[PDB]
Amino acid sequence: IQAHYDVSDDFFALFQDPTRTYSCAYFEPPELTLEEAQYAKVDLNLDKLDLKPGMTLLDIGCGWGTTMRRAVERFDVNVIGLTLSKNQHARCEQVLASIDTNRSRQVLLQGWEDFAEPVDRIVSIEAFEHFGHENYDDFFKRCFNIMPADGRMTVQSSVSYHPYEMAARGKKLSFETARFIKFIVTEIFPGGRLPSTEMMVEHGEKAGFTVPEPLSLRPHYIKTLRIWGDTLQSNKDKAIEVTSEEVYNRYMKYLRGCEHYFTDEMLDCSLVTYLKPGAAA
Ligand SMILES: C[S@@+](CC[C@H](N)C(=O)[O-])C[C@H]1O[C@@H](n2cnc3c(N)ncnc32)[C@H](O)[C@@H]1O
In sequence order, what DSSP letters do the residues of 151-200 get, joined into one string?
A: -EEEEEEEE---HHHHHTT-HHHHHHHHHHHHHIIIIISTT-----HHHH
Residue among 108, 119, 174 at smallest CA distance from 144: 119
131 CB less than 6 Å from ligand 1? yes
3-state helix, strand, coil split of the chain in percent (to 5) is: 50, 15, 35
DSSP 22-83: -S----SSTT--HHHHHHHHHHHHHTTS---TT-EEEEES-TTSHHHHHHHHHH--EEEEEE
Task: Decide: 139 and 129 in contact? Cβ < 8 Å.
Answer: no
* Separation between Cα atoms, residue 67 and residue 22, nearest integer Å: 11
Strand partners, 108: 82
Please state, in angstroms and rounded to a whole number, the distance separating the CA atoms of residues 197 and 155: 11
Query: Cα separation of 251 and 236, whole Å?
Result: 11
Do residues 68 and 130 lie in contact, with contact meaning Cβ atoms separated by under 8 Å? no
CA distance 158 to 217: 9
Distance in angstroms (rounded) separating the CA atoms of residues 159 and 270: 7
The strand order across the sheet containing 152-159 reads: 105-109, 78-83, 56-60, 121-125, 152-159, 268-275, 215-216
In whole angstroms, how far apart are CA 46 and each of 9, 75, 192, 235? 26, 9, 25, 32
Single out the residue of 52, 72, 32, 60 nearest to residue 224, CA to CA.
Answer: 32
**Residues recorded for the chain:** 281
Report the atom number in ligand 1 closest to the C-alpha of 20.
9
Distance (Å) from CA 62 to ligand 1 centroid:
6
How close is the Cα of 169 to the center of ligand 1, in Å?
32
Method of determination? X-ray
This structure's resolution (Å) is 2.0
The C-alpha atoms of residue 205 and residue 207 are separated, in whole angstroms, by 5
Count H helices and E strands in the chain, helices first. 11, 7
**How many CA within 13 A on the CB side of residue 138?**
11
Q: Is the CB of 115 under 6 A from ligand 1?
A: no
Distance in Å, CA 170 to ligand 1 centroid: 33
CB distance 177 to 160 below 8 Å: yes
- From 92, 143, 258, 269, active-site residue: 258
Please tell me whether residue 240 adopts helix, strand or coil conformation: helix
Looking at residue 50, its amino acid is D
Q: Is 143 helix (H, G, I), strand (E, B) or coil?
A: helix
Q: Is there an atom of ligand 1 within 6 Å of 270 CB? A: no
Handedness of CA 212, 214, 220, 224 (dihedral sign): positive
Q: Is the dihedral of CA 114, 119, 120, 125 positive or negative?
A: negative
148: preceding bond cis by omega (within 30 degrees): no
Could you tell me the sign of the dihedral formed by the alpha carbons of 28, 33, 38, 43, in that order? negative
| Alpha carbon distance 190, 182 (integer Å) | 10
- Cβ-based neighbours of 269, under 8 Å, separated by 6 or more: 24, 156, 157, 158, 159, 216, 217, 218, 220, 221, 262
Domain coordinates in residue numbering, the chain: 1-281
Ligand 1 pocket residue status of 62, Cβ below 6 Å: yes
- Residue 228, SS3? helix
The Cα 261–Cα 47 span in angstroms is: 29
Sign, Cα dihedral of 92, 94, 100, 101: positive
Report the topology of domain 1-281: Rossmann fold (3.40.50)
77 in contact with ligand 1, CB cutoff 6 A? no
